[PDB]
Each structure stands twice: as structure tokens, then as C-alpha cells.
Write a protein that binds this ligand. Sequence first.
Ligand SMILES: Cc1cc2nc3c(=O)[nH]c(=O)nc-3n(C[C@H](O)[C@H](O)[C@H](O)COP(=O)(O)O)c2cc1C
Ligand SMILES: Cc1cc2nc3c(=O)[nH]c(=O)nc-3n(C[C@H](O)[C@H](O)[C@H](O)COP(=O)(O)O)c2cc1C
Ligand SMILES: Cc1cc2nc3c(=O)[nH]c(=O)nc-3n(C[C@H](O)[C@H](O)[C@H](O)COP(=O)(O)O)c2cc1C
Ligand SMILES: Cc1cc2nc3c(=O)[nH]c(=O)nc-3n(C[C@H](O)[C@H](O)[C@H](O)COP(=O)(O)O)c2cc1C
Lengths: 168, 168, 168, 168
Amino acid sequence: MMSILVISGTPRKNGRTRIAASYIRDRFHTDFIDLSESELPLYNGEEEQNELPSVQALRRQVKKSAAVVLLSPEYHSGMSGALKNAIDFLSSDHWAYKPVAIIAAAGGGKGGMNALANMRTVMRGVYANVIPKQLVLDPIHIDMERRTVSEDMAVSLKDMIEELNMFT
Amino acid sequence: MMSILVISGTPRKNGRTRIAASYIRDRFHTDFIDLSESELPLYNGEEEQNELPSVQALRRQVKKSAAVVLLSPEYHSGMSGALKNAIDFLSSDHWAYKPVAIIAAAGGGKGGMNALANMRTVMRGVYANVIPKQLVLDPIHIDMERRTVSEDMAVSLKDMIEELNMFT
Amino acid sequence: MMSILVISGTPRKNGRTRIAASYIRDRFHTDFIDLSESELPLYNGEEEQNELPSVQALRRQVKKSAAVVLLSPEYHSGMSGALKNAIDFLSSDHWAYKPVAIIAAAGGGKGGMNALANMRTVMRGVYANVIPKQLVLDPIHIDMERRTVSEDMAVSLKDMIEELNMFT
Amino acid sequence: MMSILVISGTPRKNGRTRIAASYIRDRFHTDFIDLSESELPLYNGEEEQNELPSVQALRRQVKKSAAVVLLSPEYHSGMSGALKNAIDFLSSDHWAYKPVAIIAAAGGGKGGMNALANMRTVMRGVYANVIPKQLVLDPIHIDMERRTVSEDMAVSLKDMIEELNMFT
Ligand SMILES: Cc1cc2nc3c(=O)[nH]c(=O)nc-3n(C[C@H](O)[C@H](O)[C@H](O)COP(=O)(O)O)c2cc1C
Ligand SMILES: Cc1cc2nc3c(=O)[nH]c(=O)nc-3n(C[C@H](O)[C@H](O)[C@H](O)COP(=O)(O)O)c2cc1C
Ligand SMILES: Cc1cc2nc3c(=O)[nH]c(=O)nc-3n(C[C@H](O)[C@H](O)[C@H](O)COP(=O)(O)O)c2cc1C
Ligand SMILES: Cc1cc2nc3c(=O)[nH]c(=O)nc-3n(C[C@H](O)[C@H](O)[C@H](O)COP(=O)(O)O)c2cc1C
């Protein structure tokens, strides 16, 4: 399913979001953008950034994807600045009508729902079609030592991919 | 009023948000953070970033301020990635109970309200006290040639500063 | 297109939302729920309400519809209490995967976007598929004397119905 | 503390929100509005509603309060229609600058955060000052048999009242 693009929105190379994103990439054989090892600079509006290979690659990969799984940690009740910075390079030219499944990684408790709301609002702002199924990944869902997701989360992610494909 | 800190959240050196932010800085004699000329890197969670002068300065300036005017452009129905990246370096240690006035710069029409909602949610996430008065700056409110705000917007900004001081 | 259900969420019989909703009903030959002339009581959780004809009709009409146009005025930065009360009688049994187009009627200026966000969040909460195209109807878009919508709004509504049908 | 007004926003007489709201009323000796036993009709915009005793009482009680604890269940990712209906009778005349603490009652899991966001947005829409401290009451926090809150929730509510008083 290389027509699906998984975007790992944590900038932390050891972040939980990246464990979940890499799991999805390998389980469903997707394309991948990893914001913990990206050469993207901070967007600054200057024309020269349009010529940067990292920016050109981001735009090309997002535009070509048939569907996106968008993962972000919840940092201070919003998506990560790293993910929002990447989105600021993009527009409805890359996203319009694209099916998108959103996942937030949180710290437990009630966390993650504010990031999901922020992601849904921004995705609608680029005219994406965010599917109803959304997920919060808590620490209980991530095995740090084995670098994978829990059994129940794996079932949930399969259901999410099935719904994403239905909207594609 | 150097106890007020104005944060210009656009990364664009010629951005409208920066014209409004600089106006407030000069009119009310505030401290200033300009995310269009910052050395802040993308937050990456690594311990080494705690030693960076740009990060130390951001934390020191926010923590010491008695109140903040937080300005951001609305990019894709959210605050800028540049501003969110800066906030990701911070915590309730720098923001708790601080009075904050939020301003979004938009393109006209209905724009700006989604950025304001995102800013209010993230600010509450660091335990700031966002005051009720909020503003959207549209192109009609910004004189690009004279690099200042319109007469009606200047009145609105004075009312905002007065309310911010009341909550301080 | 009686498979489309238009829900007029204003409780005001002379409200602008109802002018727009009735326009859509007549232009596209839809089903109709009018919350300005409904016998629905306030939801109170009591079992007896499940037997009320108004509640049974609301549930039957929503469940059978292939798609919904959901209109609400923005009252205090949210959808109307009348519309939310009606939704409180419903569940994912009536809404799951249903394509929904949301419209907010506002007072001009920046109004309407908070109602749209509230509507999108609640609709996702019942598992509906809210389409990307959303509209705010301002007073300039409503002819009170002729009880219809402006020419530009009529074009926008046709585009909205076309997109809604695509997602159906 | 009769200058504090507690608003129980569930319409269900046996609802968990009402157990928490009644606990606060009795513990802190507050004024009380109970939307499970209210004579308020659905707001309909007609002038005659301004003369109804229930509407006059709601407006008088809210306006006179020095601070409000606003409780609502989360119904479909928003505040209850009953509470929103009551707010639709009100305006900034009753709420402007009033300190407000928001509490959502949820079903467990991740629930409650969408109601809190909706409540914060609507309260800002009437110019209230919603304090940073917010709470979600889950079933674990409510003793149905004893009709009171758990020990840890009682501590949290005392901290909330202390913060509300600070903003008053
Ligand atoms: C700056 C920062 C802010 C955070 N804010 C939140 C938050 O608002 N809510 C939450 O549930 N977790 C929050 N967390 C914890 C993350 O959810 C947690 O680290 C999770 O593993 C996702 O981040 P990661 O993918 O980088 O590991 C925050 C973490 C950091 C470093
Ligand atoms: C990537 C990008 C996204 C934008 N998204 C929005 C938007 O969602 N809503 C809006 O009203 N304006 C949007 N704008 C326009 C800005 O509001 C406008 O440029 C304004 O001047 C603020 O940006 P600035 O301070 O960088 O100039 C966007 C601009 C850019 C470059
Ligand atoms: C109680 C009340 C609250 C309102 N709040 C808002 C608001 O927050 N934002 C806005 O743009 N208009 C607001 N309005 C104005 C409505 O948007 C306007 O009346 C519009 O016509 C939709 O309402 P209607 O369909 O009942 O006419 C409010 C009107 C009332 C009566
Ligand atoms: C129509 C309806 C919708 C509900 N929606 C949600 C929801 O979106 N999220 C949630 O956590 N709980 C939801 N609940 C469960 C309530 O949170 C739970 O009943 C809680 O006790 C608060 O309601 P109460 O005060 O009326 O008892 C819903 C309950 C009903 C009856």
C-alpha cells in the first residue's frame, strides 16, 4: 500500500509517535515521512525555500499519496510544531479531497483530544477529508523495548486502515 | 511597559503579523520576540537544546514577563508552525497564570478564528490565563507602505492592552 | 433528492437559517426538519421520551437519510441549543458514516466559524462524515423580503450539494 | 459563598453531573440552577419569552453571581443541548468578565475534553473569563449510591473553588 503515506509528526527520534508510525509503515507497506530526521527548515515564506530538495520532496510525496495517516504527539494541547511547520509548506494543492486518518500520541489520562481537534481543523483547512475514525496512542499502547504497538492497538490500526481505504 | 512581552509569531520577515507586533512593541514599550529573525531550531527533544542560547533566552523572557501579547498568522486554520515550535520549548513553568492576549492575522473574510481557537487551547494547555478580548487583523487593518496599523485597529489594540493590564 | 435531509437548526420561525434551509429544501427537493415548529421537548433521558412521536420521527428521518445538510445559527460561538437538543436524542445509530454538509448562519464579520467547529466536532462524535465544504451565511446572503438566498450563495449551495452527493 | 452560582447542566434528574453539582452547592454554600427541574422552554426568539418567570430568574441569577461553576455532561462531544439552550437566553450582559470554572462529566476513557472546549468557546463568546483549571468527572469520580464525589475529586474541586475565588 505505497499509495498510503504515513507522516510521523514527532521531532523526537525516540518518540512514541515514531514507534507507532514505523509500525504502520511496515505493517501496511506505506510511504513514510519522518519529521525526526527531516532536513526541512522552519518555513519562512521566502521564495528560495521552494527550491530546497526537502521542501520539493515533501510536496511531491504528499501530493502523490492516495491517502495519509497523520500522526502527531500532543504537545501542549496541540499538534507538534514540527508537524505544523511541515504543513505550512503545503496547501490544498497537495491535500484537497485526500482521505486522512489522524492519530495523536499522548501521555495518558485525557490527553490527545486537543491535538486531534487541531489536526482535524488544520486538515479541513487544506481541504482534506479526515475520516471519522481517530485514535489516541497512550503509553500503554506502545512497547518501548520491542518498539511496537500493543495487541489491541494493532487491531485498532487495522480497522483504521480499512476505513481509510474505504474513503479512498 | 517592558513587563509586557509581545511575541511576533510570523516567520515571514515581511509578514503582516510582524507589522502589528512591532507597532504594539513601540506604542506600549514592550519586550519583544520576533520569530522571523530567531535562531531557535526546530524542537527535537534532545537535552543539548536546553543549553542553546536561543532556547535559554526564550524561556527566560517568557518566564519573566508579567503578561504576553501573542500574535500569530492563521496558516491553514491554525497558528503558525513557527510559533507552535517556540511554544514546544516552553511549559507551565513559563506560562502558569500569566495573562495573555491573543491576536491572529488573517487574509480577510472569515479567516483568523481557527488560529484564535488553537492559540486559546494551547495557551490553556500551559496554564496561561487568556483574556476574553481577542482580535483578528485583516489586510484592511495593516498599512504595508507605512508599516503600521489602521486607526480603528490602534484603538482596539489600546483597549486590549488596558484589559490585559487589568488581568495582571 | 428526498434522500437528502435538510435540518433547519434555528428555533426562530423568522430566522435567517430557516430561509436558507427552506431554499435548499425547495431547490433540491429534500426532506426537511424544522426546529422552529417542532414538538420535540428538551431531552431529559427518561425512557418515556422514546415513545414520543416527535422523537420517533426525528430518529426515523435522520436514520433513513442518505445525506444531511445541517444548518444552525451561531448563537454565542456555538450551534443553537435547539439543534444540540435534537442531536442529543440521536446517536451513531442514526448518523454513522453519513455524509453531512454543515452551514452556519452568522451576523456578519467573523461570525459563524465557532459554530462550524462545534458542528464538525459533534457530528464526528456521532461518526458522521462531514464533508470539507462548509459555508457561513451572513445577512448579505439572505434576502429577508423575498425569503431566499443571494445569487452568489445559491451558486455556493449548488456546489455544496454536488460535493455532498459525491461523498454519498 | 452564595455569590458563587453552580449551574448543573444535565437535563437528567439522575445524572452524574447533578450529583457533582449538588455536592459543590452543599460543600461551598452556593446558589444553584438545576437544568433537570427547570421550567425553561426551548429558546425561540419570541418577545413573550422575556416575560417568562423561568427566563427572568435565569437572567437575574446569572447576572448577580460573582462567579459561576458551569457543569455539563459531554453529550456527543459537546455540552448538553439543555445547557446550551439556557445560555441562548443569556448574553454578555449576564456574563461579561465573570470568572467561570468549567467541569464536564464524561463516560470514562478520553471523554469530556470536547465538551470542555465547547464550553470554553461559548463562555468566551459571552465574554466570561474561564479560569485555567478545568475538570472532567468520570464515573470513577461519582458515587451513585452515596450521591457524592470521590475523595480525590473533592480535593480537586476545592482547588478549583480556590482558583475561582482568586480570579474573582
Ligand atoms: C513539550 C511537550 C508537551 C507535551 N504536551 C502534552 C500534552 O499536552 N498532553 C499530553 O497528553 N501529553 C503531552 N506531552 C507528552 C507526549 O504526549 C508524550 O511524550 C508522547 O510520547 C508523545 O510524544 P513523542 O512522540 O515525542 O514521544 C508533551 C510532551 C512534551 C515534550
Ligand atoms: C501557508 C499559508 C497559509 C495560510 N492560511 C491562511 C488561513 O488558513 N486563513 C487565512 O485567513 N489566511 C491564511 N493565510 C494568509 C495569512 O493570513 C496572511 O498572509 C497574513 O498576512 C498573515 O501572515 P503573515 O503575518 O506571515 O503575513 C495563509 C498564508 C500562508 C503563507
Ligand atoms: C442568542 C443569540 C446569540 C447569537 N450569537 C451570535 C454569535 O455568536 N455570532 C454571530 O455571528 N451571530 C450571533 N447571533 C446572530 C445570529 O447569527 C443571527 O441572528 C442569524 O440571523 C442567525 O440566527 P437565526 O437563524 O435565528 O436568524 C446570535 C443571535 C442570538 C439571538
Ligand atoms: C445522548 C448522550 C450522549 C453522550 N455522549 C458522550 C460523549 O460524547 N462522551 C462521553 O464521554 N460520554 C458521553 N455520554 C455519557 C455521559 O458522559 C454520562 O452519561 C455522564 O454520566 C454524564 O451525563 P449525566 O450527567 O446526564 O449522567 C453521553 C450520554 C448520552 C445520554
